[PDB]
Scaffold this active site. Structure first.
Site, mmCIF file in Angstrom:
data_model
loop_
_atom_site.group_PDB
_atom_site.id
_atom_site.type_symbol
_atom_site.label_atom_id
_atom_site.label_comp_id
_atom_site.label_asym_id
_atom_site.label_seq_id
_atom_site.Cartn_x
_atom_site.Cartn_y
_atom_site.Cartn_z
ATOM 1 N N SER A 108 0.790 -1.293 -0.082
ATOM 2 C CA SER A 108 -0.018 0.058 -0.036
ATOM 3 C C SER A 108 0.763 1.269 -0.014
ATOM 4 O O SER A 108 1.672 1.349 -0.998
ATOM 5 C CB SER A 108 -1.024 -0.014 0.994
ATOM 6 O OG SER A 108 -2.060 1.010 1.270
ATOM 7 N N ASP A 133 -8.585 -5.107 -5.816
ATOM 8 C CA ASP A 133 -8.106 -3.837 -5.102
ATOM 9 C C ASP A 133 -8.781 -2.695 -5.327
ATOM 10 O O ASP A 133 -8.738 -2.362 -6.488
ATOM 11 C CB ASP A 133 -6.433 -3.702 -5.037
ATOM 12 C CG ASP A 133 -5.777 -2.675 -4.089
ATOM 13 O OD1 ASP A 133 -6.693 -1.719 -3.797
ATOM 14 O OD2 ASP A 133 -4.751 -2.997 -3.684
ATOM 15 N N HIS A 149 -7.314 -5.650 -1.046
ATOM 16 C CA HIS A 149 -6.129 -4.533 -0.744
ATOM 17 C C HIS A 149 -5.332 -5.179 0.325
ATOM 18 O O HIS A 149 -5.411 -5.075 1.136
ATOM 19 C CB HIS A 149 -6.669 -3.073 -0.345
ATOM 20 C CG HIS A 149 -5.532 -2.134 -0.236
ATOM 21 N ND1 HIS A 149 -4.709 -1.860 -1.288
ATOM 22 C CD2 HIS A 149 -5.165 -1.298 0.796
ATOM 23 C CE1 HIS A 149 -3.760 -0.894 -0.928
ATOM 24 N NE2 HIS A 149 -4.080 -0.545 0.292
#
Ligand SMILES: [Ca+2]
Length: 562
Positions: A184, A451, A487
């Protein structure tokens, strides 16, 4: 006469306790403590006896009147494998982890548990201190220009230098190789390092990398305004309830329709869309069928539990298409249809996709990340220049009135003491990795197809630009897309994997990962006790060998799509 890698050498690193020379003269050591070995737990591998050093760099006062400093925590094992390790961040940072060297991928082992020296930072601000009620809480560091620069690139630079200096003094030699793993925001950090500081790390894993993070709030305003016509009811401020646009059952219907169109496009019906490119060319929710009843997914008349209203189909199609300005110029990218938009494990629907654009359905308030949550707040205060602080209750309305001809320009702009744009200090879009590659650097990217924070297709587009700019890029950089994965973790896919082991093999032995073993953290999505699959280097996908258990990686190989 202090022996190296010893308790005496550890405690000598503290301020006023010896002769340690830090690269940054404004380095303050607050802790230099010898730590006994820690046994394994249900969620963590055992930690060897080590020296823990923690402190801060460049303590100062920001132009907002708040204190700022770059915190670090470093752990140097008494028994050391000669490798240096830094873990990446997440969210908007602001927190200092245990700094045992997380490797992501839902893994039990830490880098410190493998006898690496490990370090972490908070990125230059502290969520406990840099919490401004008039600047949207813990994103308030965006009010200080230097705090932005520290968040973008400078904190990780200072902390890398400080860690390598302590390693050199504690052990009496520099690390043989250095490694960085982040997902991320940490994935953006890894890409930033390969571009901006090519010699800081020899091996980099960058998962779900927000390398265009200032554009996320642009996508958030777009998906918010796209889903609003399908919203039902209003929140306390009179803003449409974006979370009510789709129920969990509705999203599962969309996922089942995606599977009906795309699951078998890889040769095996197994709840996984391995052939994502063929899926994008085939799936349209306005035309696709509901495979349970054979009827069209889009409702012919009134809404039932077995169809999506035409307004819903229009809304999600526009959201997935991506933001454009008045000229029709794409401002971010489009998103891939995938089965991990939903999923059912027992009686629990997957929240891992809808939490980003929609939020929880069972709420009378908006709570999506991109509507009123952290991502929308971060864009306004951290990425728009000049920053746009406001009360927390105004964020959802601000996304609803977002202007795609005026507001997107603010991520490229400078203003007053904000002398770099947010794309300048936070962006990591450069394909110039020659310095990184030519000193032996290796990079593994990974991205879940489902995601909703950052588009996997946008990482793929970066990787294609990389290969065009650098012929033979597969020799040092490879991208592993994960079907069904949300994610950084979760979703109906093989979302768990050990990225550190193949990264070391690539850097130190020149063995490129032709596949990476992965397993599902929630195999109940497929109704099985376990599922293992190979991850394949872009543009390859997993292909069933034609015999054996479909839940065993050994019966799959990486190949060009059918
Ligand atoms: Ca399949």
């Amino acid at each position: 006469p202090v022996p190296l890698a010893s308790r005496a050498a550890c405690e000598a690193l503290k301020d006023g306790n010896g002769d340690m020379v830090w690269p940054n003269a404004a380095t303050v050591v607050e802790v230099a403590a010898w730590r006994d070995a820690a046994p394994a737990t249900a969620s963590a591998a055992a930690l060897p006896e080590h020296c823990e050093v923690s402190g801060a760099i460049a303590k100062r006062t920001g132009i907002d009147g708040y204190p700022y400093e770059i915190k670090f925590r470093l752990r140097m094992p008494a028994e050391w494998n000669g490798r240096f390790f830094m873990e990446g961040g997440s969210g908007t940072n602001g927190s200092l982890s245990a700094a045992t060297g997380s490797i992501g991928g839902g893994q039990i082992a830490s880098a410190l548990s493998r006898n690496f020296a490990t370090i972490a930072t908070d990125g230059g601000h502290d969520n406990a201190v840099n919490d401004n009620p008039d600047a949207l809480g813990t994103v308030a560091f965006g009010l200080d220009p230097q705090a932005r620069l520290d968040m973008g690139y400078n904190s990780y630079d200072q902390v890398t230098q400080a860690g390598k200096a302590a390693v050199a003094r504690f052990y009496g030699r520099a690390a043989d190789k250095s490694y960085f793993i982040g997902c991320s925001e940490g994935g953006r950090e890894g890409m930033m390092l390969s571009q901006r500081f090519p010699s800081h790390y020899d091996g980099i894993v960058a998962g779900a990398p927000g390398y265009q993070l200032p554009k996320a709030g642009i996508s958030g305003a777009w998906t918010t305004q796209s889903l609003a016509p399908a919203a039902v009811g209003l929140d306390a401020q009179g803003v449409p309830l974006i979370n009510k646009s789709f129920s969990d059952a509705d999203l599962h219907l969309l996922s089942q329709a995606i599977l009906g169109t795309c699951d078998a496009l890889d040769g095996l019906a197994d709840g996984i869309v391995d052939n994502y490119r063929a899926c994008q060319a085939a799936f349209d929710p306005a035309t696709a069928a509901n495979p349970a009843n054979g009827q069209a997914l889009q409702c012919v008349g009134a809404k039932t539990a077995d169809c999506l209203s035409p307004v819903q189909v229009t809304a999600i199609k526009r959201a997935m298409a991506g933001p454009v300005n008045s000229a029709g110029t794409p401002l971010y990218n489009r998103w891939a249809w995938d089965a991990g938009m939903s999923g059912l494990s027992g009686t629990t629907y997957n929240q891992g996709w809808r939490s980003w654009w929609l939020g929880s359905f069972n709420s009378s308030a908006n709570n999506a990340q991109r509507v009123s949550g952290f991502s929308a707040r971060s864009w306004l205060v951290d990425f728009a220049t000049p920053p746009e602080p406001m009360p927390m209750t105004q964020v959802a309305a601000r996304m609803m009135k977002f202007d795609f001809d005026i507001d997107p320009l603010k991520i490229w702009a400078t203003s007053g003491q904000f002398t770099q744009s947010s794309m300048d200090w936070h962006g990591a879009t450069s394909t110039d990795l020659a310095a990184f590659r030519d000193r032996g650097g290796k990079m593994i990217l990974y991205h879940g197809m489902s995601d909703a924070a950052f588009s996997a297709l946008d990482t793929a587009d970066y990787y294609e630009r990389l290969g065009a700019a650098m012929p033979g890029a597969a020799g040092f950089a490879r991208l592993f897309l994960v079907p069904g994965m949300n994610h950084c973790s979760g979703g109906p896919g093989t979302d768990r994997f050990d990225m550190l082991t193949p990264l070391v093999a690539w850097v130190e032995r020149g063995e490129a990962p032709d596949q990476i073993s992965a397993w599902s953290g929630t195999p109940g999505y497929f109704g099985v006790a376990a599922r293992t699959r190979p991850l394949c280097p872009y543009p390859q996908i997993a292909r069933y060998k034609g015999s054996g258990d479909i839940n065993t990686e050994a019966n799959f190989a990486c190949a060009a799509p059918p």
